[PDB]
Amino acid sequence: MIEAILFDVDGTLAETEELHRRAFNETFAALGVDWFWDREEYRELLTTTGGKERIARFLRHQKGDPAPLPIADIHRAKTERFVALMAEGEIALRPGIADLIAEAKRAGIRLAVATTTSLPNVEALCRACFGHPAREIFDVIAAGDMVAEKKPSPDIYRLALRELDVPPERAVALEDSLNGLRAAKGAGLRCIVSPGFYTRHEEFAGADRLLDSFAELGGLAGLDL
């Protein structure tokens, strides 16, 4: 039985990371520092999950301007920009996502996000893509600093499962990245992977299904096999 479906957010519900990159760059520009993350560098920086963590890693190694503000302050400013960007643009859910979530709801299946993205990021996506606050879409929101150890650690998925009160055998995860797959699998979850722009280069050995589009599931039916 599928009692619950768990979703990563960025790269799974919607293709958002390019917008995140824009928000980072426009933030650095706004602060007047010489930092710029191009697509190539951002692809590498995405192996560090967590916004603050990604900023920290970069600032530990980069040779340009020193940080003018602490990590958290930079991330807050970037978050405000991302939230604004989500509100104005026309971000679409990835193919198949809307239909799967509607099917699940009709079927009395609970939905959760398990993500390294922050809560304001989740809210922004839900408002823009679903037209409703996150709590109206997802029964359980496990996000950001709610756990100490980020993906590939399974901790965020363990938290999500604990809050859902659903054991892994009655749940399934949808992911877009290797770190995500590893985190789901470490929590004992079957995991459906469909990569996005920034993770198409990765390898997903051990994914229960690997798809070009979540639409290939044909909804709930594709989760059983």
Swiss-Prot record:
Substrate binds at residues 8, 17, 50-54, 75-78, 115-121. Changing R54A: 97% decreased catalytic activity with xylulose-1,5-bisphosphate, but no effect on activity with ribulose-1,5-bisphosphate. Changing K78A: 40% to 80% decreased catalytic activity with xylulose-1,5-bisphosphate, but no effect on activity with ribulose-1,5-bisphosphate. The active site is at D8 (nucleophile), D10 (proton donor). GO terms for biological process: xylulose catabolic process. This is Protein CbbY. Keywords: Hydrolase, Magnesium, Metal-binding. Changing Y42A: 40% to 80% decreased catalytic activity with xylulose-1,5-bisphosphate, but no effect on activity with ribulose-1,5-bisphosphate. Mg(2+) binds at D8, D10, D176. Its cofactor is Mg(2+). Highly selective xylulose-1,5-bisphosphate (XuBP) phosphatase. Also shows activity towards ribulose-1,5-bisphosphate (RuBP) and fructose-1,6-bisphosphate (FBP), but not towards fructose-6-phosphate (F6P) or ribulose-5-phosphate (Ru5P). Degrades xylulose-1,5-bisphosphate, a potent inhibitor of rubisco produced by the rubisco itself. It catalyses: D-xylulose 1,5-bisphosphate + H2O = D-xylulose 5-phosphate + phosphate. Signal peptide: none annotated. It comes from the Bacteria.
